[PDB]
Amino acid sequence: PTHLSVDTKFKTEGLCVDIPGIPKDMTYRRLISMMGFKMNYQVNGYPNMFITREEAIRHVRAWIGFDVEGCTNLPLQLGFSTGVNLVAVPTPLMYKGLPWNVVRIKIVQMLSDTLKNLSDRVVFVLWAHGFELTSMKYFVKIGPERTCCLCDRRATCFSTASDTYACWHHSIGFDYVYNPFMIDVQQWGFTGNLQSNHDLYCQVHGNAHVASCDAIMTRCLAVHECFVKRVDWTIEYPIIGDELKINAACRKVQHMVVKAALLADKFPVLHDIGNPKAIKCVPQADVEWKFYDAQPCSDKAYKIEELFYSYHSDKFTDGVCLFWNCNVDRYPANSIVCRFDTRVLSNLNLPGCDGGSLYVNKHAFHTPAFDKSAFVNLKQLPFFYYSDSPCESHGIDYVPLKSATCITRCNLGGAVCRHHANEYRLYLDAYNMMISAGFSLWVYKQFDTYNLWNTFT
Ligand SMILES: CNC(=O)C1(Cc2ccccc2F)CC1
Numbered sequence: 001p002t003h004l005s006v007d008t009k010f011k012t013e014g015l016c017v018d019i020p021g022i023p024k025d026m027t028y029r030r031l032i033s034m035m036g037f038k039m040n041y042q043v044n045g046y047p048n049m050f051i052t053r054e055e056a057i058r059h060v061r062a063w064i065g066f067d068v069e070g071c072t073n074l075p076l077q078l079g080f081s082t083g084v085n086l087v088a089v090p091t092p093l094m095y096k097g098l099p100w101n102v103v104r105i106k107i108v109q110m111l112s113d114t115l116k117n118l119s120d121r122v123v124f125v126l127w128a129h130g131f132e133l134t135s136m137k138y139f140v141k142i143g144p145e146r147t148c149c150l151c152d153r154r155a156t157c158f159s160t161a162s163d164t165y166a167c168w169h170h171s172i173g174f175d176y177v178y179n180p181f182m183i184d185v186q187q188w189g190f191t192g193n194l195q196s197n198h199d200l201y202c203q204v205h206g207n208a209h210v211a212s213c214d215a216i217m218t219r220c221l222a223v224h225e226c227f228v229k230r231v232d233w234t235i236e237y238p239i240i241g242d243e244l245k246i247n248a249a250c251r252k253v254q255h256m257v258v259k260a261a262l263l264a265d266k267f268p269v270l271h272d273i274g275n276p277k278a279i280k281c282v283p284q285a286d287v288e289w290k291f292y293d294a295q296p297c298s299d300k301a302y303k304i305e306e307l308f309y310s311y312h313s314d315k316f317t318d319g320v321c322l323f324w325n326c327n328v329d330r331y332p333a334n335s336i337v338c339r340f341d342t343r344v345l346s347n348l349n350l351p352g353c354d355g356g357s358l359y360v361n362k363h364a365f366h367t368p369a370f371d372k373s374a375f376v377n378l379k380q381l382p383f384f385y386y387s388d389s390p391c392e393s394h395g396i397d398y399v400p401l402k403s404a405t406c407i408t409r410c411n412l413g414g415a416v417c418r419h420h421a422n423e424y425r426l427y428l429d430a431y432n433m434m435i436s437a438g439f440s441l442w443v444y445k446q447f448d449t450y451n452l453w454n455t456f457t
Pocket residue numbers: 018019022031034035036130133134
């Protein structure tokens with residue numbers, strides 16, 4: 001129960017229009033052989049080109065939808081979920097017809113640039129009809145598991161010019177994809193074609209009829225099945241960037257913003273709606289803290305009418321509501337909100353289904369599409385740093401800080417002390433880290449930082 005057995009059956013029905021006469025009885029072992037690959041009883045970490053659904057989910061950062069549409073004398077259109085379309089000749093980025101020896105070079109360049117900061121491998125996500133599997137021998141080479149010639153990462157590319165192997169970071173000028181993975185979505189038990197199944201859940205990807213459109217719809221449908229309709233928050237993903245800093249920044253911003261709203265507007269009660277594991281972000285606040293459980297929505301954003309109504313203080317209008325990563329359709333006017341913006345471009349955020357995005361930071365979270373109208377009763381929360389801690393350096397070099405948003409006793413009394421200048425700059429860094437990761441902060445309209453200066457009287 002580790003890898004997908006080569007002796008597992010492969011339903012070949014989807015393959016019979018490009019490959020008429022294909023045997024109904026078929027295994028992975030016979031399919032790989034038919035694709036032109038020899039596995040030679042090799043016990044070297046590459047037991048099968050095809051992988052299980054569970055392995056595909058653990059390597060979601062490696063997913064690249066691939067589709068081949070025909071144009072012996074058949075020129076092929078090679079579509080990738082990066083939006084790239086290459087034309088191979090036997091001899092929405094649309095490239096003219098070229099022979100395989102140059103096409104394979106462009107393929108290694110594209111996958112290397114797309115994946116070097118995401119994953120140690122490639123997973124071709126297919127809706128297999130025939131031509132994509134038969135085309136693989138023209139750009140893929142297989143063998144035992146290898147390491148890069150320039151480093152210790154696993155080898156993902158091969159060069160017939162130098163006879164060496166490279167990872168995605170060192171494969172400049174390499175021509176073959178080495179030991180790729182693949183999964184046929186059509187093997188999951190679907191009725192109807194790709195578009196009919198895709199269009200049931202997503203109105204964002206259309207069918208222009210080019211190979212890359214299908215490659216996009218395939219990866220999208222695969223993401224919906226594995227992360228929208230089925231959610232598994234137990235699967236851990238490796239650290240590939242600023243994960244730890246972003247998470248630390250998020251907890252610092254939360255404490256700061258909630259601590260200041262309770263000081264400025266002195267709400268008697270706070271309704272904390274979201275994560276059933278949540279802890280009081282401001283443990284020393286006077287306020288009555290009431291929790292309401294709601295797991296992260298992955299399909300559509302929660303309707304505020306279902307979260308609140310149907311008969312808890314019952315009066316959510318009393319006090320303030322804290323929606324920290326709790327994605328609802330329209331926030332009530334008395335709210336403190338942290339909403340992830342799915343449009344953000346990063347190595348942590350991968351494209352999702354129906355405008356949503358798959359945010360992968362320790363765990364995978366499909367987030368519904370960012371909608372500006374959710375925030376009509378609120379305003380954008382401005383940057384501010386508040387601190388009531390004593391001015392005492394205790395224990396890096398200095399330049400005097402001058403800022404209208406440093407809300408401290410020292411700034412009230414004229415000059416900012418070294419301690420609050422160091423802490424203000426660290427907090428500004430954490431804030432910029434969090435904003436740039438895609439998170440966006442919103443607050444009730446009466447929120448004024450001018451009300452914080454009187455907490456120094
Ligand atoms: C167009 N057909 C092919 O090139 C063949 C190999 C082949 C490749 C992939 C899957 C099944 C298969 F049978 C029959 C030779």
